[PDB]
């Protein structure tokens, strides 16, 4: 039960990354390709707890 | 894999699996290592599907 919002880049290598990303350090956010052309295993389910 | 990141900056490092940093936490037994040379304009279509 801990929401975490952060736009900072996460380093995944020996080099320290501050504003450069793409090869060794990645951006921690990926989007959904929510299209109606899929079947059932990729549709957006509106989940409330 | 700590001696892997000292062979010049890369061009594409997108992956469809586990992280390179967590490779040390899981112990393996069989990995394929094959290499070739293609023109730099033809790297983009090396992708699953």
């Amino acid at each position: 039960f801990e929401r975490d919002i952060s736009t900072e880049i996460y380093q995944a290598g020996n080099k320290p990354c501050n504003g450069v990303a793409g090869f060794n350090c990645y951006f921690p956010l990926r989007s959904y390709g929510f299209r109606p052309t899929y079947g059932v295993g990729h549709q957006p389910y509106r989940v409330v707890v | 894999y700590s001696v892997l990141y000292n062979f010049a900056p890369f061009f594409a490092f997108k992956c469809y699996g586990v992280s390179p940093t967590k490779l040390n936490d899981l112990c393996f037994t069989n990995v394929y290592a094959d290499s070739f040379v293609i023109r730099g304009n033809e790297v983009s279509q090396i992708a699953p599907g």
Partner: antibody
Amino acid sequence: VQLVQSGAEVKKPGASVKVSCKASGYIFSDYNIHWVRQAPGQGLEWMGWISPDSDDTNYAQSFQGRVTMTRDTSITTVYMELSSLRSDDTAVYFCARSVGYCSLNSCQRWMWFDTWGQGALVTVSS
Amino acid sequence: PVLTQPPSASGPPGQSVSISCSGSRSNIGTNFVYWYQQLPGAAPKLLIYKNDQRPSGVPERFFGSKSGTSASLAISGLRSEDEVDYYCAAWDDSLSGHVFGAGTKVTVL
């Protein structure tokens, strides 16, 4: 799809000018629009984005109070107006549609202007 | 803010000439870079999306990439369609909106 839009002509400064964008072919409920301007012999500049299915809106950090927006979903159009026009605003205006859908601030990264609307040069003189 | 590009760059046909596009910490490097070309007296169109790929109808002739806080584009063959200008585009957080380049002109020799 085709993105015909109606331009304007030479006009007195400080008046109100109406420019409209028409959407055809594709369904006009799922794609954002973006507004850009191009001065002659100059790089492009960004205005903001407006959702078609909502009153969603957002503007740039320099052009805030001189711009409003109007939607006509029944006519399947969007309406764009300029108030307090300047001398160095004689720029061609593009009704740019971006692929996908974004309303959040952090959503704008994956957005490229898939298609553009042909523009007409709007001028201001007396 | 704006992105610094050379106003012009030219090369003879049959070989490859490149265009540079510098960027700051927030302008590029933490984000994705897109490129647009425009025919003179016409509407601009997409050239490279998602920093590597091209849309349908754009051939394999076009290529562009970035390494650090700057991006580069490569063309090969200047016959009838590469005399147009090119633009470098990205997204940042200081202006909270799309920031575009100045403009690059490519001719033939």
